[PDB]
Enzyme design. Structure first.
Site, PDB file in Angstrom:
ATOM      1  CG  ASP A  25      24.693 -14.507 -60.227  1.00 42.43           C
ATOM      2  OD1 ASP A  25      23.565 -14.009 -60.074  1.00 42.43           O
ATOM      3  OD2 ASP A  25      25.411 -14.335 -61.242  1.00 42.43           O
ATOM      4  CB  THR A  26      19.844 -15.446 -56.249  1.00 41.96           C
ATOM      5  OG1 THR A  26      19.755 -14.022 -56.344  1.00 41.96           O
ATOM      6  CG2 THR A  26      20.384 -15.854 -54.880  1.00 41.96           C
ATOM      7  N   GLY A  27      20.576 -14.919 -59.538  1.00 42.91           N
ATOM      8  CA  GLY A  27      20.074 -14.700 -60.880  1.00 42.91           C
ATOM      9  C   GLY A  27      20.673 -15.625 -61.922  1.00 42.91           C
TER      10      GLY A  27
HETATM   11  C1  XUS Z   1      15.452 -14.451 -71.698  1.00 39.26           C
HETATM   12  C2  XUS Z   1      16.761 -15.211 -71.306  1.00 39.26           C
HETATM   13  O1  XUS Z   1      17.726 -14.927 -72.267  1.00 39.26           O
HETATM   14  P1  XUS Z   1      19.241 -15.484 -72.150  1.00 39.26           P
HETATM   15  O2  XUS Z   1      19.233 -16.916 -71.760  1.00 39.26           O
HETATM   16  C3  XUS Z   1      20.130 -14.499 -70.824  1.00 39.26           C
HETATM   17  O3  XUS Z   1      19.140 -14.272 -69.821  1.00 39.26           O
HETATM   18  C4  XUS Z   1      19.663 -13.818 -68.542  1.00 39.26           C
HETATM   19  C5  XUS Z   1      20.717 -12.755 -68.524  1.00 39.26           C
HETATM   20  C6  XUS Z   1      21.271 -12.261 -67.173  1.00 39.26           C
HETATM   21  C7  XUS Z   1      20.724 -12.856 -65.883  1.00 39.26           C
HETATM   22  C8  XUS Z   1      21.317 -12.341 -64.527  1.00 39.26           C
HETATM   23  C9  XUS Z   1      22.779 -12.785 -64.491  1.00 39.26           C
HETATM   24  N1  XUS Z   1      22.814 -14.239 -64.571  1.00 39.26           N
HETATM   25  C10 XUS Z   1      23.528 -14.976 -65.595  1.00 39.26           C
HETATM   26  O4  XUS Z   1      24.281 -14.446 -66.398  1.00 39.26           O
HETATM   27  O5  XUS Z   1      23.270 -16.402 -65.587  1.00 39.26           O
HETATM   28  C11 XUS Z   1      23.760 -17.216 -66.657  1.00 39.26           C
HETATM   29  C12 XUS Z   1      24.358 -18.551 -65.897  1.00 39.26           C
HETATM   30  O6  XUS Z   1      23.214 -19.182 -65.484  1.00 39.26           O
HETATM   31  C13 XUS Z   1      22.187 -18.930 -66.612  1.00 39.26           C
HETATM   32  O7  XUS Z   1      21.058 -18.621 -66.108  1.00 39.26           O
HETATM   33  C14 XUS Z   1      20.706 -17.094 -66.578  1.00 39.26           C
HETATM   34  C15 XUS Z   1      21.571 -16.734 -67.510  1.00 39.26           C
HETATM   35  C16 XUS Z   1      22.742 -17.671 -67.409  1.00 39.26           C
HETATM   36  C17 XUS Z   1      23.458 -12.420 -63.155  1.00 39.26           C
HETATM   37  O8  XUS Z   1      22.625 -12.846 -62.124  1.00 39.26           O
HETATM   38  C18 XUS Z   1      23.671 -10.904 -63.079  1.00 39.26           C
HETATM   39  N2  XUS Z   1      24.746 -10.528 -64.095  1.00 39.26           N
HETATM   40  C19 XUS Z   1      26.141 -10.250 -63.600  1.00 39.26           C
HETATM   41  C20 XUS Z   1      26.869 -11.595 -63.284  1.00 39.26           C
HETATM   42  C21 XUS Z   1      27.272 -12.315 -64.534  1.00 39.26           C
HETATM   43  C22 XUS Z   1      28.110 -11.252 -62.423  1.00 39.26           C
HETATM   44  C23 XUS Z   1      28.949 -10.140 -63.111  1.00 39.26           C
HETATM   45  S1  XUS Z   1      24.228  -9.503 -65.397  1.00 39.26           S
HETATM   46  O9  XUS Z   1      22.927  -9.919 -65.935  1.00 39.26           O
HETATM   47  O10 XUS Z   1      25.194  -9.598 -66.523  1.00 39.26           O
HETATM   48  C24 XUS Z   1      24.142  -7.836 -64.697  1.00 39.26           C
HETATM   49  C25 XUS Z   1      25.392  -6.972 -64.726  1.00 39.26           C
HETATM   50  C26 XUS Z   1      25.330  -5.594 -64.128  1.00 39.26           C
HETATM   51  C27 XUS Z   1      24.040  -5.100 -63.496  1.00 39.26           C
HETATM   52  N3  XUS Z   1      23.973  -3.805 -62.932  1.00 39.26           N
HETATM   53  C28 XUS Z   1      22.803  -5.988 -63.468  1.00 39.26           C
HETATM   54  C29 XUS Z   1      22.853  -7.355 -64.067  1.00 39.26           C
HETATM   55  C30 XUS Z   1      19.656 -13.920 -65.904  1.00 39.26           C
HETATM   56  C31 XUS Z   1      19.118 -14.418 -67.256  1.00 39.26           C
HETATM   57  O11 XUS Z   1      19.965 -15.352 -73.647  1.00 39.26           O
HETATM   58  C32 XUS Z   1      21.261 -14.810 -73.801  1.00 39.26           C
HETATM   59  C33 XUS Z   1      21.153 -13.452 -74.627  1.00 39.26           C
END
Ligand code: XUS
EC number: 3.4.23.16
Lengths: 99, 99
Positions: A25-27
């Protein structure tokens, strides 16, 4: 290897002597795994995602093998929908995006 | 190009005649962008991740230019904390994970 993205980039990991499936998960900044019995000390922590924040157990300096590649670093354990390998460990195994 | 993962893999995209910044996200099944006012018909949808689900608007056959590489596919628009390019478009620009 080279992994295309037509399907979810799922790989087998070994952690605490157990095999699991996890998403590259690069995100994700951080690695988050579903609830599991993991050896080691841990501290409570909060991590946020698309839907808000969850409570996790933070384990530091955990050994984890990702498709035969060894890494040692922080693993968060909590109610994630799927096991995700984040950039903190992807960098250790030398993973890059290429197009 | 080759993008290392020491930092967030942020790139400039062009969509609907606008330039935006988005994360190349191998963990996202579909592309999700910040609230934006896009011409066309759309379908409601819910997408889930860490912390739960958010409500988004599904637009189909949207063009996006990503570092000069063109892709056409589904774009979800809603109150997302982050702009992410998901696998539905990453495959179109030939993006792979390599380690
Ligand atoms: C302004 C910052 O606000 P924030 O910190 C949250 O910001 C964020 C939120 C989401 C991401 C991207 C997601 N990464 C993530 O969850 O990473 C966690 C762990 O590592 C930390 O790093 C960043 C967050 C923490 C992931 O790549 C993709 N996801 C699915 C994954 C879980 C597999 C099912 S998806 O987004 O749910 C998603 C689902 C369906 C579709 N079609 C498109 C996207 C990056 C930063 O505050 C909280 C409100």
């Amino acid at each position: 290897p080279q992994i295309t993205l037509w399907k979810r980039p799922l790989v087998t990991i070994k952690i605490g002597g157990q095999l699991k499936e996890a998403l590259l998960d690069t995100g994700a900044d951080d690695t988050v795994l579903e609830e599991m019995n993991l050896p080691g000390r841990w501290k409570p922590k909060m991590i946020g995602g698309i839907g808000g924040f969850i409570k996790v157990r933070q384990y530091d300096q955990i050994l984890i093998e990702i498709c035969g590649h060894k890494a040692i670093g922080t693993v968060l354990v909590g109610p994630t929908p799927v096991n995700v390998i984040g950039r903190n460990l992807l960098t250790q195994i030398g993973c890059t995006l290429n197009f």
